[PDB]
Amino acid sequence: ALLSFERKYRVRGGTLIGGDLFDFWVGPFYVGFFGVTTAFFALLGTILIFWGASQQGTFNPWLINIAPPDLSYGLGMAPLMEGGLWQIITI
Amino acid sequence: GTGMSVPEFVSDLDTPDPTIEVFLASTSDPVIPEEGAQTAGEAYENVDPVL
């Protein structure tokens, strides 16, 4: 479903990378290489957040808490339950 | 994750109190009292706390 003046603007080209491999629309949204990357990263982050919420013991929106590791771990990696999920979600 | 911490410069953590070395240069070990030792009250005229 397009606006009454939208069709003439829906042309091909103007991509930084990908050409016509990802040059199309899904509803109103425009898809590209970076649309695919955005969808992947956002879905992974959301699902990881809800996995951490399930393992915490609460699904209350006000009470979900995912926290960074302790100061003793420094700049290294922490166990995924003791603050590593936070690092993954940050990435 | 609560933000509860105390920051300090590393160069300031390595600097001790400049008066600690003064105390260690003006202290001495105690002397164990002997049998029938003469007290300071029998050698001078002083105050009872220090007698």
Inter-chain CB proximity A68 and B5 less than 8 Å? no
Chain A, window 40-69: residues with a beta carbon less than 8 angstroms from a chain B beta carbon: 65, 67-68
> What residues are paired with A26 via a beta bridge?
A29
- The DSSP line for B29-42 is ------TTPPPGGG
CB atoms within 10 A of CB B1: 11
- Rg of chain B over Cα atoms, rounded to whole angstroms, equals 23
Resolution in A: 2.8
Those residues whose C-beta lies under 8 Å from the C-beta of residue A87, and which sit 6 or more positions away, are A68, A69, A77, A78
Q: Do A86 and A67 touch, CB atoms closer than 8 A?
A: yes
Inter-chain CB proximity B1 and A71 less than 8 Å? no
Inter-chain CB proximity A65 and B5 less than 8 Å? no
Inter-chain CB proximity B1 and A67 less than 8 Å? yes
* φ, ψ (nearest 5 deg) of residue A18: 115, -25
Residue B45, CB-side half-sphere exposure with 13 Å CA sphere:
0
Take residue B46 and report the two structure tokens written for it.
């002083």
Closest residue, chain B, to A71 (C-alpha): B5
Chain B, window 1-40: residues with a beta carbon less than 8 angstroms from a chain A beta carbon: 1, 5
Take residue A81 and report the two structure tokens written for it.
């339950």
Q: How far apart are CA A87 and CA B3, in angstroms?
A: 17
